[PDB]
Amino acid sequence: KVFGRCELAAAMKRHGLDNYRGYSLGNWVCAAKFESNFNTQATNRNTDGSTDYGILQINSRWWCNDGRTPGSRNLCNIPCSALLSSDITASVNCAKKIVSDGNGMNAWVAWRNRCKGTDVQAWIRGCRL
Numbered sequence: 001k002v003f004g005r006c007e008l009a010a011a012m013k014r015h016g017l018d019n020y021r022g023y024s025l026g027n028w029v030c031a032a033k034f035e036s037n038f039n040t041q042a043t044n045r046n047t048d049g050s051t052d053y054g055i056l057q058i059n060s061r062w063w064c065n066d067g068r069t070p071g072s073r074n075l076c077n078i079p080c081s082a083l084l085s086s087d088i089t090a091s092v093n094c095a096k097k098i099v100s101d102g103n104g105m106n107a108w109v110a111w112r113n114r115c116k117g118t119d120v121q122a123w124i125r126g127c128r129l
């Protein structure tokens, strides 16, 4: 599924991301835009042979099992393919574990480089929430 901006903001709010570990909703919408272009089916392979999955580009080295990343962890206890679903539940639940890990949203490269320090409220402007 390719979400619209305000449709994803509403889905993220329903799933408890607004202000989760102090990150306002616009931070999560910005991260999703730049990680996946709001596409739940996005995948990208990394140099190390791990792969990033779904709307928040969660990595198989640590967070999910894809059967092809040797010596990796599965800290979210899920197949990586669950992160591709039109239902964002699994991605959100995993994202909550990641953001609690000690580096906050800095775990997401695109957030650090493209959202951090910007007017992230723009991402939710106009939306009925």
Ligand SMILES: [Cl-]
Residues within 6 Å of the ligand: 024, 025, 026, 027, 120, 121, 124
């Ligand atoms: Cl915000």
Ligand SMILES: [Cl-]
Residues within 6 Å of the ligand: 060, 061, 062, 063, 064, 065, 066, 069, 072, 073, 074
């Ligand atoms: Cl893994």
Ligand SMILES: [Cl-]
Residues within 6 Å of the ligand: 021, 103, 104, 105
């Ligand atoms: Cl933090």
